[PDB]
Enzyme design. Sequence first.
Site, short mmCIF file in Angstrom:
data_model
loop_
_atom_site.label_atom_id
_atom_site.label_comp_id
_atom_site.label_asym_id
_atom_site.label_seq_id
_atom_site.Cartn_x
_atom_site.Cartn_y
_atom_site.Cartn_z
N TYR B 29 0.93 -1.47 -0.02
CA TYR B 29 0.07 0.15 0.06
C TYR B 29 0.84 1.14 -0.22
N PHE B 39 2.11 10.15 3.47
CA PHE B 39 1.89 9.72 4.14
C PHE B 39 2.44 8.21 5.11
N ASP B 40 2.47 6.85 4.30
CA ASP B 40 3.22 6.03 4.66
C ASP B 40 3.52 5.42 3.53
N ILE B 59 -8.68 -0.12 10.16
CA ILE B 59 -9.45 1.36 9.78
C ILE B 59 -10.65 0.37 8.86
N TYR B 85 -9.36 7.69 10.64
CA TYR B 85 -9.54 7.52 11.62
C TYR B 85 -9.82 9.16 12.74
N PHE B 102 -5.82 5.57 -0.53
CA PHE B 102 -4.69 3.85 -0.42
C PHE B 102 -4.84 3.30 -1.55
C1 LIG Z 1 -5.52 5.95 16.58
C2 LIG Z 1 -5.02 6.77 17.50
C3 LIG Z 1 -4.84 6.72 18.67
C4 LIG Z 1 -4.83 7.53 20.27
C5 LIG Z 1 -4.84 8.37 20.60
C6 LIG Z 1 -6.55 7.40 21.17
C7 LIG Z 1 -4.67 8.93 21.79
C8 LIG Z 1 -3.37 8.30 22.79
C9 LIG Z 1 -2.99 9.26 24.17
C10 LIG Z 1 -2.11 7.65 22.61
C11 LIG Z 1 -0.76 8.46 22.04
O1 LIG Z 1 -0.81 9.24 21.07
C12 LIG Z 1 0.13 10.17 20.96
C13 LIG Z 1 0.32 7.37 22.01
O2 LIG Z 1 0.68 6.55 22.62
C14 LIG Z 1 1.67 5.98 23.16
O3 LIG Z 1 2.92 6.92 23.17
C15 LIG Z 1 1.55 5.91 24.79
O4 LIG Z 1 2.24 6.35 25.62
C16 LIG Z 1 0.99 3.89 24.83
O5 LIG Z 1 1.38 2.96 24.61
N1 LIG Z 1 -0.10 3.80 25.19
C17 LIG Z 1 -1.06 4.81 25.38
C18 LIG Z 1 -1.89 4.82 26.52
C19 LIG Z 1 -2.54 3.63 27.12
C20 LIG Z 1 -1.16 1.83 26.43
C21 LIG Z 1 -1.14 2.64 25.27
C22 LIG Z 1 -2.06 1.70 24.38
O6 LIG Z 1 -2.26 0.73 24.71
O7 LIG Z 1 -2.19 3.03 23.29
C23 LIG Z 1 -3.49 2.52 22.08
C24 LIG Z 1 -3.00 1.43 21.47
C25 LIG Z 1 -1.57 2.34 20.25
C26 LIG Z 1 -2.71 0.53 21.00
C27 LIG Z 1 -2.58 -0.93 19.67
C28 LIG Z 1 -3.38 -0.63 18.27
C29 LIG Z 1 -3.19 -1.65 17.30
C30 LIG Z 1 -2.48 -3.12 18.15
O8 LIG Z 1 -2.41 -4.13 17.21
C31 LIG Z 1 -1.79 -3.09 19.39
O9 LIG Z 1 -1.50 -4.47 19.73
C32 LIG Z 1 -0.14 -4.45 20.11
C33 LIG Z 1 -2.01 -2.09 20.36
C34 LIG Z 1 -3.96 3.67 22.21
C35 LIG Z 1 -4.25 4.65 23.15
C36 LIG Z 1 -4.93 3.16 21.32
O10 LIG Z 1 -6.29 2.79 21.69
C37 LIG Z 1 -6.22 5.03 20.36
C38 LIG Z 1 -4.37 4.95 19.10
O11 LIG Z 1 -3.57 4.71 18.69
C39 LIG Z 1 2.02 4.91 22.00
C40 LIG Z 1 2.98 4.40 21.57
C41 LIG Z 1 1.45 5.52 20.62
C42 LIG Z 1 -0.28 6.28 20.73
O12 LIG Z 1 -0.28 6.89 19.49
C43 LIG Z 1 -0.89 6.21 18.54
C1 LIG Z 2 1.34 -1.75 16.88
C2 LIG Z 2 1.78 -1.16 15.76
C3 LIG Z 2 0.72 -1.86 14.85
C4 LIG Z 2 2.40 -1.74 13.18
C5 LIG Z 2 2.10 -2.28 11.95
C6 LIG Z 2 1.52 -3.58 12.35
C7 LIG Z 2 2.98 -1.65 11.23
C8 LIG Z 2 2.26 -1.07 10.18
C9 LIG Z 2 3.32 -1.53 8.38
C10 LIG Z 2 0.84 -0.15 10.42
C11 LIG Z 2 1.86 1.29 10.00
O1 LIG Z 2 3.77 1.18 10.51
C12 LIG Z 2 4.47 2.02 9.80
C13 LIG Z 2 1.18 2.65 9.98
O2 LIG Z 2 0.52 2.45 9.26
C14 LIG Z 2 0.20 4.10 8.98
O3 LIG Z 2 1.00 4.62 8.83
C15 LIG Z 2 -1.05 3.77 7.85
O4 LIG Z 2 -0.22 3.31 6.86
C16 LIG Z 2 -2.64 3.03 8.32
O5 LIG Z 2 -3.07 4.15 7.85
N1 LIG Z 2 -3.30 1.97 7.64
C17 LIG Z 2 -1.42 0.63 7.43
C18 LIG Z 2 -2.30 0.02 7.23
C19 LIG Z 2 -3.31 -0.41 7.13
C20 LIG Z 2 -5.01 0.26 6.68
C21 LIG Z 2 -4.60 1.30 7.96
C22 LIG Z 2 -4.73 0.81 9.38
O6 LIG Z 2 -5.49 0.22 9.55
O7 LIG Z 2 -3.65 0.58 9.98
C23 LIG Z 2 -3.80 0.14 11.47
C24 LIG Z 2 -3.80 1.13 12.82
C25 LIG Z 2 -2.93 1.89 13.13
C26 LIG Z 2 -5.27 0.10 13.71
C27 LIG Z 2 -6.24 1.93 14.58
C28 LIG Z 2 -5.69 1.26 15.61
C29 LIG Z 2 -6.02 1.74 17.13
C30 LIG Z 2 -7.87 2.17 16.76
O8 LIG Z 2 -8.01 2.70 17.66
C31 LIG Z 2 -7.92 2.66 15.23
O9 LIG Z 2 -8.88 2.86 15.18
C32 LIG Z 2 -9.42 4.05 14.43
C33 LIG Z 2 -7.10 2.31 14.34
C34 LIG Z 2 -2.22 -0.66 12.15
C35 LIG Z 2 -1.45 -1.64 11.03
C36 LIG Z 2 -2.37 -1.80 13.46
O10 LIG Z 2 -3.55 -2.83 13.62
C37 LIG Z 2 -1.14 -2.18 14.26
C38 LIG Z 2 -0.35 -1.48 14.33
O11 LIG Z 2 -0.72 0.00 14.73
C39 LIG Z 2 -0.74 4.86 10.52
C40 LIG Z 2 -1.47 5.20 10.15
C41 LIG Z 2 0.22 3.89 11.23
C42 LIG Z 2 1.24 3.26 11.76
O12 LIG Z 2 2.02 2.82 12.78
C43 LIG Z 2 1.13 2.90 13.68
#
Ligand SMILES: CC[C@@H]1/C=C(\C)C[C@H](C)C[C@H](OC)[C@H]2O[C@@](O)(C(=O)C(=O)N3CCCC[C@H]3C(=O)O[C@H](/C(C)=C/[C@@H]3CC[C@@H](O)[C@H](OC)C3)[C@H](C)[C@@H](O)CC1=O)[C@H](C)C[C@@H]2OC
Ligand SMILES: CC[C@@H]1/C=C(\C)C[C@H](C)C[C@H](OC)[C@H]2O[C@@](O)(C(=O)C(=O)N3CCCC[C@H]3C(=O)O[C@H](/C(C)=C/[C@@H]3CC[C@@H](O)[C@H](OC)C3)[C@H](C)[C@@H](O)CC1=O)[C@H](C)C[C@@H]2OC
Lengths: 124, 114
Positions: B29, B39-40, B59, B85, B102
């Site tokens: 992608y 952006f990616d 998403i 998002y 995308f």
């Molecule tokens: C889609 C955007 C949405 C962002 C927010 C609502 C703002 C919120 C303040 C996140 C920070 O935004 C500045 C920032 O916080 C971190 O720095 C952190 O400190 C942490 O680790 N947190 C954060 C505090 C709780 C514990 C832990 C965590 O669980 O965060 C979740 C997280 C990233 C879960 C992944 C999702 C994919 C899944 O695969 C994976 O499975 C292992 C778990 C967040 C809250 C997502 O539910 C929603 C967002 O991502 C992490 C590093 C990145 C994160 O930024 C994106």
């Molecule tokens: C725990 C880390 C884990 C990261 C990977 C496995 C590597 C993978 C290559 C992501 C990129 O890492 C360089 C990078 O990809 C983006 O740049 C993108 O291009 C996008 O948009 N993608 C990516 C392509 C699919 C569609 C879309 C997307 O859905 O991504 C998911 C995502 C971020 C879902 C959030 C989770 C919290 C929830 O609240 C929120 O609800 C709206 C949706 C990813 C794949 C998570 O399933 C797992 C990770 O986060 C986004 C911006 C941020 C992302 O980096 C962190």
Amino acid sequence: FEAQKIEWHEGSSGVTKELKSPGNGVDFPKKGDFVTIHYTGRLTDGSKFDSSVDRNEPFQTQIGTGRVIKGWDEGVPQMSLGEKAVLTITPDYGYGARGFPGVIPGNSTLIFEVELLGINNKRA
Amino acid sequence: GSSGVTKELKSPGNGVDFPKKGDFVTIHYTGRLTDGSKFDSSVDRNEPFQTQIGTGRVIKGWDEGVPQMSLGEKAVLTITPDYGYGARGFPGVIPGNSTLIFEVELLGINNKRA
Ligand SMILES: CC[C@@H]1/C=C(\C)C[C@H](C)C[C@H](OC)[C@H]2O[C@@](O)(C(=O)C(=O)N3CCCC[C@H]3C(=O)O[C@H](/C(C)=C/[C@@H]3CC[C@@H](O)[C@H](OC)C3)[C@H](C)[C@@H](O)CC1=O)[C@H](C)C[C@@H]2OC
Ligand SMILES: CC[C@@H]1/C=C(\C)C[C@H](C)C[C@H](OC)[C@H]2O[C@@](O)(C(=O)C(=O)N3CCCC[C@H]3C(=O)O[C@H](/C(C)=C/[C@@H]3CC[C@@H](O)[C@H](OC)C3)[C@H](C)[C@@H](O)CC1=O)[C@H](C)C[C@@H]2OC
């Protein structure tokens, strides 16, 4: 019912919660509750990777439903309202082999300073 | 006004194999904003992206759009923020209330290749 979980561990990989300052010992988050938390996240070398305190934006999530990393979903329900604790989370309960791109390296243990400020409409 | 998820075909797949909800997919992608900025891109890293589709791990626009692609297909997926998002955006990457564009290539479905 009252209690203080002064040390709590679940697993060696896993998550450890160490109480630093007590909450009210009565109100604990249950699955599905919305929690309000101030946190600072560090790696094991002490380096900070994020902080809700630094941006003056309390973090809110539904707990116990898989919206946050497993160490939080398991550790936060062991805190009572107002508690300050330290959560130490091995990769299996955190971001695993990949880490979080741009923020957390692969295979990172995480250290979160956490303060439980709210459970639903209850406020510390 | 209107919102939603649109898929525009760029190159057809085999027209036979489609991802079902719960299938693993392997995808290349590139993501862009409506101003054209990238952006990616998994292509730029040369690393195929793998996820389980249709289970809420990505998403909504991907969970909805990818199952309509056949193996090998290249398409463009346009996703308004209510299927992406939302008002929050993605910290440091995606502004709040962003439509996402995308380029998507379905490289594999589970162990199936073209
Ligand atoms: C889609 C955007 C949405 C962002 C927010 C609502 C703002 C919120 C303040 C996140 C920070 O935004 C500045 C920032 O916080 C971190 O720095 C952190 O400190 C942490 O680790 N947190 C954060 C505090 C709780 C514990 C832990 C965590 O669980 O965060 C979740 C997280 C990233 C879960 C992944 C999702 C994919 C899944 O695969 C994976 O499975 C292992 C778990 C967040 C809250 C997502 O539910 C929603 C967002 O991502 C992490 C590093 C990145 C994160 O930024 C994106
Ligand atoms: C725990 C880390 C884990 C990261 C990977 C496995 C590597 C993978 C290559 C992501 C990129 O890492 C360089 C990078 O990809 C983006 O740049 C993108 O291009 C996008 O948009 N993608 C990516 C392509 C699919 C569609 C879309 C997307 O859905 O991504 C998911 C995502 C971020 C879902 C959030 C989770 C919290 C929830 O609240 C929120 O609800 C709206 C949706 C990813 C794949 C998570 O399933 C797992 C990770 O986060 C986004 C911006 C941020 C992302 O980096 C962190």
